[PDB]
Amino acid sequence: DLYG
Amino acid sequence: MNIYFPKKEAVTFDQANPTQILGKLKELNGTAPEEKKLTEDDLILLEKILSLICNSSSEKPTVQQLQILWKAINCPEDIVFPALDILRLSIKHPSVNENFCNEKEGAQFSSHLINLLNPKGKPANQLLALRTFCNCFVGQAGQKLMMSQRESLMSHAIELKSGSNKNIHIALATLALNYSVCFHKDHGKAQCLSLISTILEVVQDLEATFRLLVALGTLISDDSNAVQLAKSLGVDSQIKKYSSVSEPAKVSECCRFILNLL
Amino acid sequence: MNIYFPKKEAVTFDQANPTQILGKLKELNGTAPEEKKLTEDDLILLEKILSLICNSSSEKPTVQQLQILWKAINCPEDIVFPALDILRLSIKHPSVNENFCNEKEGAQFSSHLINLLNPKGKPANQLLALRTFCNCFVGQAGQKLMMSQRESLMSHAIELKSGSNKNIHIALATLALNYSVCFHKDHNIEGKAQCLSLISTILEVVQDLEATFRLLVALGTLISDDSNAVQLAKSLGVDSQIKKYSSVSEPAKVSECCRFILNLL
Ligand SMILES: [Mg+2]
């Protein structure tokens, strides 16, 4: 879910 | 011993996506005020760290690179997460583990990361700081530091059991599991048991649940005193409900092996 | 320097759900013809291997356990994939690596797995045999066996390029990658030539972007610091072949890796  | 536990080595976060990490790092750095912004030479040194780690080079990271990594993880909280991801990846490497987690200077490292575990923090920062702590157990220095700092880290972990962020919960469950590995290895367990139980009570993600059960099986394995403590306390009663869980199969199966010891 | 290549250690298949592997092994063992069925005791021993590997134990699998693993990967081709998966996980462990890949017995092991690459065979077997070969590069004995069996292994792997699934393309790409790591560290030109042939051939066919990425990493690893490998890459037209990858938006790692390679070609 971080990136990007 | 069965296919679930006791784990004899740390469970780690190894996924390597250096293009994405480096991309976001440059993008977010560009939003920093000029005083805080990492220079082009700083960014090249971080890229080099990633290269050494990702290519499995025999060339060791330099002091200069690790100093820049430290600076990078001290940047404003809104934009630190890519540098935290570089750290999460890098901290498994012996040179990096030793230079961040050694006896004399490790308290500075852990206190900084623990500051990022504040419940009002950015979830990306909380998640990556937790994953970094999970990863530092691979080294002897990281292991020593996690043990000497355990009161602080466990306290902060517990406070993140709230809500429903599955990734944070998985990282919490993995942190418990890596602690269990350490206690299994030696002879404390009572503290580790309260940690596992407190998180397990609240977490919904089945991967997190699984890793907590692996942590519990690991904690009591091959220690007659630990099994008896668990039996006396009635741990079997608190985990019985997982024995019926049908998917993933690993949850019920791991639970049935623990119940077999109790 | 770049974050893509040259890779200096093997790229491996590390993912493990022993619950599912054991589940399917036990399930399919029941369907086996009577003389080939693994016994209750054999199954206990296979579980013990998986336990040791999955828990990262400091204890070695027993020779008895390894004989049973050999027995298990010789079961009927239609039900052998769970046992191949145990082998795929186990072959990274130094004592397992040495016991299957050593100079005395290595050729028997590699020949059996090569047979499971036949494209007319079962795709789960093709995939797991390839992943197993990728994984045996982590150990000194596996590395040596892969180099000694190179001509045969790559020639048989090459034949999987047509009508194969993306997971097979990824494993083929990773096989070339792991060979590239070896040749980069020790320049063998005929080996590098065949590796470049494998890379070029799969690039002509490959559509999956992870497979594409691993082929680019392999190519970069091969041609690094080796003017002869560049020369051979040119003869095959690999330089013009990879130009389409410059315009790949997502994932960015494909075009980025390609741009570093085009700088050397
Ligand atoms: Mg704050």
Side-chain angles (χ1 to χ4, degrees), chain A, chain B residues 1-39 41-103 105-139 141-150 152-158 160-185 188-230 232-262, chain C residues 1-39 41-58 61-97 99-103 106-150 152-186 188-248 251-265:
Chain A
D1 217 332
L2 267 14
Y3 300 102
Chain B
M1 205 199 304
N2 52 74
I3 66 185
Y4 304 116
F5 66 85
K7 297 275 187 200
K8 275 180 80 154
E9 299 188 359
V11 169
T12 59
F13 295 88
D14 305 328
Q15 294 192 23
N17 53 324
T19 309
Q20 279 187 333
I21 290 172
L22 176 60
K24 203 75 175 203
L25 164 71
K26 296 180 186 192
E27 178 191 331
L28 302 196
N29 190 63
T31 74
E34 297 299 321
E35 291 192 335
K36 283 308 283 268
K37 204 171 262 184
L38 299 161
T39 58
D41 294 323
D42 292 336
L43 296 171
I44 295 175
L45 290 168
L46 297 167
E47 185 170 347
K48 180 75 183 151
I49 290 168
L50 273 176
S51 173
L52 298 178
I53 300 309
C54 294
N55 294 321
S56 311
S57 187
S58 301
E59 189 188 323
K60 316 278 191 47
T62 60
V63 158
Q64 176 182 17
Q65 288 157 14
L66 291 190
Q67 291 186 326
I68 296 310
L69 183 50
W70 176 244
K71 179 196 177 172
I73 67 174
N74 279 271
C75 281
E77 287 190 52
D78 185 56
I79 62 175
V80 68
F81 86 81
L84 289 176
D85 220 349
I86 299 171
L87 177 67
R88 181 272 307 182
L89 246 164
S90 298
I91 200 64
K92 298 157 62 206
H93 187 282
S95 296
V96 181
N97 199 270
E98 300 177 41
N99 287 275
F100 288 112
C101 302
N102 71 75
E103 210 171 337
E105 287 160 343
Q108 183 163 204
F109 178 65
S110 52
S111 289
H112 177 62
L113 286 184
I114 284 159
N115 281 146
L116 302 177
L117 291 171
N118 189 299
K120 291 204 200 79
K122 195 187 219 317
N125 295 352
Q126 291 162 339
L127 173 63
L128 291 167
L130 289 172
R131 291 182 174 166
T132 300
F133 285 134
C134 288
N135 288 355
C136 82
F137 284 95
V138 295
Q143 204 160 0
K144 287 180 178 29
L145 183 65
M146 300 294 97
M147 297 291 264
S148 64
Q149 302 302 313
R150 78 184 173 254
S152 195
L153 179 56
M154 292 179 174
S155 295
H156 285 84
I158 288 296
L160 300 167
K161 74 191 160 64
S162 305
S164 53
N165 185 314
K166 73 164 172 71
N167 292 312
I168 288 181
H169 289 176
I170 285 161
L172 286 176
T174 307
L175 181 62
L177 186 176
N178 287 357
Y179 270 121
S180 293
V181 169
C182 295
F183 290 108
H184 169 68
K185 257 43 254 310
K189 290 193 177 84
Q191 193 168 21
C192 197
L193 186 68
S194 40
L195 170 77
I196 288 163
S197 302
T198 305
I199 299 174
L200 185 64
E201 178 199 346
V202 86
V203 152
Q204 213 65 211
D205 180 90
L206 276 340
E207 184 63 30
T209 301
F210 175 67
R211 291 191 192 190
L212 287 161
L213 289 171
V214 171
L216 177 60
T218 303
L219 184 68
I220 65 181
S221 286
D222 297 343
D223 176 358
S224 66
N225 284 358
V227 174
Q228 183 55 46
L229 184 59
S232 279
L233 205 54
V235 172
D236 57 354
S237 172
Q238 74 202 336
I239 69 163
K240 191 185 178 287
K241 83 180 102 152
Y242 302 110
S243 182
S244 321
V245 169
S246 177
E247 196 192 48
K250 61 183 183 176
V251 165
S252 56
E253 292 277 83
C254 186
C255 179
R256 311 223 273 235
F257 278 106
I258 296 165
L259 292 170
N260 216 293
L261 288 186
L262 305 180
Chain C
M1 68 78 191
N2 70 74
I3 58 181
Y4 309 107
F5 63 83
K7 285 270 178 296
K8 306 289 192 149
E9 277 190 354
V11 168
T12 58
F13 294 89
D14 299 338
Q15 68 295 325
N17 195 351
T19 306
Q20 270 186 338
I21 297 171
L22 262 197
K24 203 65 150 183
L25 190 93
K26 294 173 316 215
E27 180 169 34
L28 291 189
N29 194 54
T31 317
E34 192 43 61
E35 290 300 333
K36 303 291 308 204
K37 190 176 272 85
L38 300 174
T39 62
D41 277 7
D42 297 330
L43 293 173
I44 296 169
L45 296 165
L46 288 172
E47 192 168 337
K48 286 180 141 43
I49 303 175
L50 217 35
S51 291
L52 282 181
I53 299 311
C54 291
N55 286 309
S56 312
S57 176
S58 67
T62 61
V63 308
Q64 194 187 15
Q65 282 160 6
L66 297 188
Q67 296 173 334
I68 297 308
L69 184 49
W70 178 245
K71 178 185 176 180
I73 68 176
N74 281 274
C75 280
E77 284 185 27
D78 67 345
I79 65 173
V80 74
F81 78 86
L84 285 176
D85 219 356
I86 297 171
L87 176 70
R88 182 273 308 186
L89 282 160
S90 298
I91 196 57
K92 300 188 268 161
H93 183 102
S95 42
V96 182
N97 194 274
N99 274 255
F100 289 104
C101 302
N102 66 64
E103 226 169 357
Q108 194 171 346
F109 176 72
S110 63
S111 292
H112 176 59
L113 293 186
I114 288 171
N115 285 169
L116 294 170
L117 303 178
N118 186 329
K120 312 300 198 287
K122 194 174 170 303
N125 298 348
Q126 296 149 6
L127 181 61
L128 295 175
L130 292 171
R131 288 179 176 164
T132 295
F133 280 138
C134 291
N135 284 1
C136 84
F137 282 90
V138 305
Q140 182 168 25
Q143 293 161 20
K144 291 189 180 170
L145 178 67
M146 295 299 299
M147 300 293 249
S148 69
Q149 306 302 305
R150 186 205 90 245
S152 180
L153 174 52
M154 284 185 150
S155 289
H156 286 90
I158 265 288
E159 299 291 315
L160 287 170
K161 66 139 178 192
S162 303
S164 284
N165 65 52
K166 65 167 196 69
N167 291 318
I168 287 154
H169 295 168
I170 295 166
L172 284 173
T174 308
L175 187 59
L177 195 169
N178 290 355
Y179 272 116
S180 299
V181 168
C182 292
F183 308 135
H184 165 64
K185 301 182 300 182
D186 180 277
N188 164 25
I189 204 51
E190 113 215 295
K192 285 213 186 196
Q194 194 174 17
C195 205
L196 284 172
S197 176
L198 177 63
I199 296 173
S200 190
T201 297
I202 303 151
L203 281 172
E204 274 161 52
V205 82
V206 68
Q207 266 167 344
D208 178 78
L209 281 306
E210 185 63 29
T212 299
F213 176 71
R214 292 181 191 198
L215 288 168
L216 296 177
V217 173
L219 177 60
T221 300
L222 277 176
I223 68 167
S224 286
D225 298 278
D226 191 348
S227 306
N228 279 335
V230 168
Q231 221 72 269
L232 301 166
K234 291 255 163 321
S235 65
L236 259 39
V238 165
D239 47 334
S240 70
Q241 238 184 320
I242 61 164
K243 286 196 178 72
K244 75 179 66 60
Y245 303 115
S246 274
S247 66
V248 164
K253 69 185 186 186
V254 172
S255 54
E256 283 292 298
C257 188
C258 181
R259 291 187 271 246
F260 284 103
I261 302 173
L262 294 166
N263 289 332
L264 314 158
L265 247 27

